[PDB]
Amino acid sequence: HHPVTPCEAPLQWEGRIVLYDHNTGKNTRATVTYDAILQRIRILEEKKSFVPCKRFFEYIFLYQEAVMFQIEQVTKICSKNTLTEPWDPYDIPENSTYEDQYYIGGPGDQIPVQEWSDRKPARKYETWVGVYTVKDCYPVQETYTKNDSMTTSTRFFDIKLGISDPSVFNPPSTCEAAQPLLMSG
Amino acid sequence: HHPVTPCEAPLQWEGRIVLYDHNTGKNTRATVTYDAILQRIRILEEKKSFVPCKRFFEYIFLYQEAVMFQIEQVTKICSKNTLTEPWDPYDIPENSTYEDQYYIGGPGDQIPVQEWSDRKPARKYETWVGVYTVKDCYPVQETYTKNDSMTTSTRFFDIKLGISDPSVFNPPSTCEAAQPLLMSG
Ligand SMILES: [Xe]
Ligand SMILES: [Xe]
Ligand SMILES: [Xe]
Ligand SMILES: [Xe]
Ligand SMILES: [Xe]
Ligand SMILES: [Xe]
Ligand SMILES: [Xe]
Structure with a gap:
């Protein structure tokens, strides 16, 4: 029985992803703190050896x-x-x-x-x-x-419902600043 | 503890896949009968409404x-x-x-x-x-x-170990023939 509507996805979670951009062939790996209620999302890129x-x-x-x-x-x-x-x-x-x-x-x-x-x-x-x-x-x-x-x-993976740490949406001290364009060296 | 070698994947199964080719933006959907022992694989494309x-x-x-x-x-x-x-x-x-x-x-x-x-x-x-x-x-x-x-x-999904139907590797009557190149209209 074909569903009349899709299930409703969680509005808030903390998880991890891998974003594969084809333009470039790059996989970025990231930790993500997601909140659809406030329409805000924080992505912390992850480093490997x-x-x-x-x-x-x-x-x-x-x-x-x-x-x-x-x-x-x-x-x-x-x-x-x-x-x-x-x-x-x-x-x-x-x-x-x-x-x-x-x-x-x-x-x-x-x-x-x-x-x-x-x-x-x-x-x-x-x-x-x-x-x-x-x-x-x-x-x-x-x-x-x-x-x-x-x-x-x-x-998407290691998802866990809700947000243990809301501090992460608060931009750091060094953010009373301007509009550079940063990319990866 | 970083694994010294990867697990060894199954050699034979029947399952289904979706192959997303970026060149074209197309998702092909397929049923697959896979056999690494004989080095043979049969892919039956799937149709949707x-x-x-x-x-x-x-x-x-x-x-x-x-x-x-x-x-x-x-x-x-x-x-x-x-x-x-x-x-x-x-x-x-x-x-x-x-x-x-x-x-x-x-x-x-x-x-x-x-x-x-x-x-x-x-x-x-x-x-x-x-x-x-x-x-x-x-x-x-x-x-x-x-x-x-x-x-x-x-x-990959709906995978099920081993091969219930080996007939599928036998090419049909109409295959005592030649080398066309077929693609999707
Ligand atoms: Xe989305
Ligand atoms: Xe992948
Ligand atoms: Xe890749
Ligand atoms: Xe492979
Ligand atoms: Xe997908
Ligand atoms: Xe892709
Ligand atoms: Xe797509």
């Missing part, structure tokens, strides 16, 4: 106040910018096309999930697909070929 | 006999071709760099998995990443940015 990028950023997105802070974790050199952009939660729009349900993982230790997309018969390809657990409606994976081939796959 | 592609193929890959059959499921018009290519199982090479372990899905209904890649500090980006379950070492997802930006993400 013997990677060639010198630079790692914490991002703090505050859509309610239309600004994003971006801190180089090493130098601490902040970067306040504006956000023109409308907030996009990690959930499933109510107009989303159901696609499938299946069990991930082998017999015994497995788990049922669901696949939705923005497929409509008008267009050749989808621009969104998401997989979410059946029980709690947690995000597992999304792909968003947004803006003509700037496509990303995102994987 | 109100997609705009008219054409759907069953592929039968027989690496031990260096040939691939390709059947249009509608017209039945076969297409035997040669395979120059070395077989690549769905597993984790023993020289693979461990990356992480984490739980997919929310509290209660979740499942531990593992992430490996072909990262070495010599090269900026990975060209392979795979996620596999911890218990049974089942494939969950891979991304293989092979050959300079011909990158794919693959998701």
